[PDB]
Ligand binder design. Structure first.
Ligand code: GTP
Ligand code: GTP
Lengths: 246, 246
């Protein structure tokens, strides 16, 4: 049955709530496992098969003299001592299930930059990555290219197909909803909207997502909502489509 | 005299030690101001003109019930209430000095993603960004393209020339020192080293920094060391060169 979905997203994207809700959505026609890799998240809305807080939490470490930024890094360093264990735990789940959903660190960068996250990921069988954004980071043509770009970066970094998505689209007025898809799905509209800006940066910014766009056929952005279950069917089949075309 | 240098880098890059040391290096032929924007860093090796911890620290906030990841975000939300104040504080320093050095959050992403960092930056006069990496993230041809890429991303994000650099090169055996420059400065060697990898990712990865490379003449990577002062003269003149060509 075997299939892994990694939720990546920055502090305040609501991806722990998504991981939870998307699981129950799956729990109806599928066996599902939940993996928590975040050492500093308080509560979790699901039942974890693997929960690294058992082994170490950011606070325990602070309760030993570390500045907050230094205690996240230090939680991930200690995790690596159980590196092989956690890998093999995950590999077991992978083929005892249809879906293993993986919830990554809230500081996205202790997943991009620390050894644990990075090595873990590059030793899993063709995992699917979902990069979710608060659609608020989306104010103007600039905000849109950065998101495609950063998804490309994560992909590069983890060596895993990374699909970009917006979460909490149920909070969007159709006003905004309209505005975002246009900019996202009509490549040759945004790719041309990046010229009405005449400044050191209102020019480069244009030749940026201009190429990345002309190399490997870009991806569809997912619109998701833990609250309405908008987009679950889509991601469901993107998962399956991914399991095929690999 | 006016000139701003923003040090960006992830938890464990040693850029607070760099900001400190590069300042004294400058303090000999220049008037210099130090700006700390990190709410969770304990001690600082310099004298801050602006220190946001006066107004709020990550711990005070934790001492009120926030999970660590939620207390960084919450420190930056409260900062934005003094947004205009901090902007004007910085603008005053800018032309009371030759250099204002700015030390950004240790969680690089509360600078890329929160409103404070991002808006602050895009309202400063042509600031220079220095992206520093622990050269350990550098193991193989992949690690190298990601770094160029991510510097491009920051640049895009903040609308500021962003220069990539390695810090702590004094810890490098000449063995490694040799190895990194080759991969970094001989474009058409790494840009061709990205083909001896035959896998979903050992192929895309090649067409990645292949284009970005063919659009706008790439940048020289700086090798820096707070401990030996390797690279200071270089960055010094890159600062000046930047102040010119703008
Ligand atoms: N309206 C709406 N609210 C949501 C949705 N998803 C999450 N929320 C709310 O926003 C909060 C997000 O919480 P989490 O899912 O834990 O966020 P997170 O991504 O784990 O946060 P970090 O760990 O910092 O990355 C929840 O408490 C929900 O109340 C959504 O789809 N729609
Ligand atoms: N050998 C050597 N050691 C260094 C150098 N720079 C910093 N260090 C050491 O590494 C540590 C880095 O500390 P910081 O400069 O505060 O690191 P930082 O970038 O502020 O860390 P974050 O806030 O998490 O991003 C220091 O305590 C130094 O002892 C260097 O250039 N060479």
């Amino acid at each position: 049955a075997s299939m892994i979905v990694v939720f990546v997203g920055t502090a305040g994207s609501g991806k722990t709530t998504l991981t939870g809700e998307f699981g129950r959505y799956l729990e109806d026609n599928y066996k599902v496992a939940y993996v928590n890799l975040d050492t500093g998240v308080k509560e979790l809305p699901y039942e974890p098969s693997i929960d690294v807080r058992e082994f170490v939490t950011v606070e325990e470490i602070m309760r030993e003299g570390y500045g907050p930024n230094g205690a996240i890094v230090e939680s991930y360093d200690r995790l690596m001592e159980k590196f092989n264990e956690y890998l093999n735990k995950i590999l077991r789940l992978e083929k005892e299930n249809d879906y293993v959903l993986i919830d990554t660190p809230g500081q996205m960068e202790t997943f991009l930059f620390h050894e644990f996250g990075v090595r873990l990921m590059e030793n899993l069988p063709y995992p699917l990555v979902v990069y979710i954004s608060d659609p608020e980071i989306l104010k103007k043509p600039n905000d849109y290219c950065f998101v495609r770009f950063f998804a490309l970066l994560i992909d590069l970094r983890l060596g895993a197909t990374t699909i970009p998505a917006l979460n909490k689209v149920d909070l969007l007025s159709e006003e905004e909803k309209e505005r975002h898809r246009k900019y996202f799905e009509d490549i040759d509209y945004l790719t041309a909207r990046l010229k009405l800006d005449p400044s050191m940066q209102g020019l480069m910014a244009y030749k940026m997502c201009s190429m990345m766009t002309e190399v490997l056929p870009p991806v569809r952005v997912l619109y998701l909502s833990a609250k309405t279950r908008e987009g679950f069917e889509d991601l469901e089949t993107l998962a399956y489509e991914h399991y095929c075309t690999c």
